[PDB]
Scaffold this active site. Structure first.
Site, PDB file in Angstrom:
ATOM      1  N   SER A  64       6.781  -8.169  -7.116  1.00 52.82           N
ATOM      2  CA  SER A  64       6.327  -7.247  -6.086  1.00 52.82           C
ATOM      3  C   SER A  64       4.837  -7.458  -5.865  1.00 52.82           C
ATOM      4  CB  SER A  64       6.607  -5.799  -6.485  1.00 52.82           C
ATOM      5  OG  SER A  64       5.991  -4.895  -5.588  1.00 52.82           O
ATOM      6  N   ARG A  65       4.448  -7.672  -4.613  1.00 53.84           N
ATOM      7  CA  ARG A  65       3.053  -7.932  -4.282  1.00 53.84           C
ATOM      8  C   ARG A  65       2.237  -6.664  -4.104  1.00 53.84           C
ATOM      9  NH1 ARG A  65       5.483 -12.663  -1.802  1.00 53.84           N
ATOM     10  NH2 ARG A  65       4.148 -14.488  -2.128  1.00 53.84           N
ATOM     11  N   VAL A  66       2.854  -5.495  -4.227  1.00 54.51           N
ATOM     12  CA  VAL A  66       2.170  -4.219  -4.089  1.00 54.51           C
ATOM     13  C   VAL A  66       2.177  -3.458  -5.415  1.00 54.51           C
ATOM     14  CG1 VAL A  66       2.064  -2.090  -2.690  1.00 54.51           C
ATOM     15  CG2 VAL A  66       2.865  -4.220  -1.676  1.00 54.51           C
TER      16      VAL A  66
END
Lengths: 57, 119, 124, 125, 57, 55
Positions: D112-114
């Protein structure tokens, strides 16, 4: 009485009464390499610890 | 820029030795996966032992990756990293667990992490 | 000397898998492994430092005639460097003979020069 | 100012449909007979999901695109195109599925990039 | 399988095959040595067997 | 002594069998690799020509 760490590990994983082992032997062993263990094994018979010897190989 | 006359002889030698160790480790994996670790020689076992620690020590915790790692980042000077890798190659930290080398920074942080882990 | 060099290198490459089992000295083929290791050490070279053909011939002769068999593999590079310096100092007649006739010097003279350098080299 | 959740149940199927249309319209093909702007199609679609600022009302739209791989080959053309666009992926593997672990998320290949910013404080801790 | 994966498998299998061949030849030499070592033990065993059979019986 | 001889013979036989199996696997893998290589070259050349004569 077990000669060899693979058998040693087998019996330890199966929780069995191992009393002696050598676990380290040359590729071409001499008599002096097993003199002490053979002496102990034969002494245990006369010592009265156990009254029978069977050996598997 | 990786030349003896630019970075220095000690830096060059350390870098080349690290690359040699990692290259040797790459070849051992194929035979390890088949015949197990027990069949390796004592030199190959030491190579694996040190290569794993080197590969883990090449990791680092970044400042901009707190959202991913949960911990603040670190800044490591080049002299410090050269000395740390030289010590690892010499074997000063063979007794340390290999998980203590993950995402730390300086070499003293590995010792502190292992002490926290109870070694 | 190139034929002997190639034969030694090929024999080493064929036996490379036995290197781990030579640790307990299983058999007498380990001479081939040692020779191949020294050959590989000899063939290494640094950047922007070409070697004259006479010096290349002399170092390959020393390798193939067994004069490196007692030098540890970690010292071969320094041995080659010091040997080149010793040649520049004392083997000018050998170098000139090679340069002029394109052939090897006298075997006895080469052996004498190599042994003279060897008794002055210091193993690290 | 509302919050919206959108699910695209297969983007690979519109990729096939767009390839069909492009071939029927005599547009020259590219890799695997796909048109040149197969990346632009999906990027144009997915860039419209966003979290608006307070000046714009604070509404949000969030998207769950789907991609179906062949034999678990995550490095194929369309899967890599879609992976290069979104803010993370959840990769499901059949070998994990049959070994008993379900919903069979491969932790190494999923990211997950967040992450962190999209969690409750306790969950983050 | 992709070309890279197949090539990696081929190289790994080649290295494994070389290692196994070397182990086979080493074990062959060791077996020869073990056979001669066992042969060297026969006269002592024969002598002690004869002596025990003569005395204990 | 008998056990040591048996162990060495067993290792020799097992490693011989392993080497033979590895050689057979190498042969089959090489066949599959060559098939994949040919199929690839075919696919790129066909795509190139299709794009070229699409103009």
């Amino acid at each position: 009485i077990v000669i060899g760490r693979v058998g040693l590990s087998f019996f330890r994983k199966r929780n069995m009464p191992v009393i002696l082992d050598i676990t380290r032997l040359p590729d071409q062993p001499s008599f002096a390499d097993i003199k002490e263990i053979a002496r102990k094994t034969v002494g245990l018979f006369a010592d009265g610890t156990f009254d029978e010897l069977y050996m598997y190989y | 820029a990786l030349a003896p006359e630019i970075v220095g002889e000690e830096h060059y030698q350390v870098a080349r030795k690290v690359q040699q160790t990692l290259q040797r480790y790459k070849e051992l994996q194929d035979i390890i996966a088949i015949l197990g670790m027990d069949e390796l020689s004592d030199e190959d076992k030491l190579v694996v032992h040190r290569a794993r620690r080197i590969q883990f020590f090449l990791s680092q915790n970044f400042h901009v990756a707190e959202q991913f790692t949960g911990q603040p980042g670190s800044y490591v000077p080049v002299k410090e990293t050269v000395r740390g890798f030289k010590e690892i190659l010499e074997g000063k930290y063979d007794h340390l667990p290999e998980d203590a080398f993950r995402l730390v920074g300086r070499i003293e942080e590995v010792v502190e992490k292992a002490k926290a882990m109870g070694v | 000397v190139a034929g002997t060099l190639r034969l030694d290198l090929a024999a080493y490459r064929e036996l490379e898998a036995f290197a781990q089992f030579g640790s307990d000295l299983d058999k007498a083929t380990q001479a081939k492994l040692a020779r191949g290791a020294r050959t590989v050490e000899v063939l290494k070279q640094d950047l922007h430092q070409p070697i004259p053909v006479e010096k290349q011939v002399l170092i390959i002769y020393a390798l193939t005639r067994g004069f490196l068999d007692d030098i540890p593999v970690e010292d071969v590079r320094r041995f080659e460097k010091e040997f080149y310096l010793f040649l520049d100092q004392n083997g000018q007649h050998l170098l000139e003979h090679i340069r002029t006739t394109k052939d090897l010097p006298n075997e006895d003279d080469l052996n004498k020069a190599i042994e003279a350098f060897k008794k002055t080299f210091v193993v690290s | 100012g509302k919050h919206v959740l959108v699910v695209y149940d297969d983007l690979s199927k519109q990729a096939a449909a767009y390839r069909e249309l492009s071939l029927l319209l005599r547009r020259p093909p590219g890799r695997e007979a796909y048109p040149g702007d197969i990346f632009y199609l999906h990027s144009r679609l997915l860039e419209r999901a966003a979290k608006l600022s307070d000046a714009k009302g604070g509404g949000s739209l969030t998207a769950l695109p789907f991609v179906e791989t062949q034999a678990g080959d995550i490095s194929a053309y369309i899967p890599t195109n879609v992976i290069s666009i979104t803010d993370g992926q959840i990769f499901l593997q059949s070998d994990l599925f049959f070994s008993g672990v379900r919903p069979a998320i491969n932790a190494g290949l999923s990211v997950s990039r967040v992450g962190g910013a999209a969690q409750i404080k306790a969950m983050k801790k | 399988a992709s070309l890279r994966d197949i090539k990696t498998r081929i190289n790994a299998t080649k290295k494994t095959s070389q290692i196994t061949k070397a182990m086979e030849m080493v074990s062959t030499s060791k077996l020869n040595r073990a056979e001669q070592n066992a042969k060297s033990f026969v006269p002592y065993m024969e002598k002690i067997q004869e002596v025990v059979a003569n005395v204990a019986l | 002594l008998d056990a040591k001889a048996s162990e060495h013979a067993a290792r020799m036989t097992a490693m011989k069998n392993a080497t033979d199996n590895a050689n057979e696997l190498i042969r089959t893998l090489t066949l599959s690799y060559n098939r994949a290589r040919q199929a690839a070259i075919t696919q790129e050349i066909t795509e190139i020509v299709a794009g070229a004569n699409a103009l």
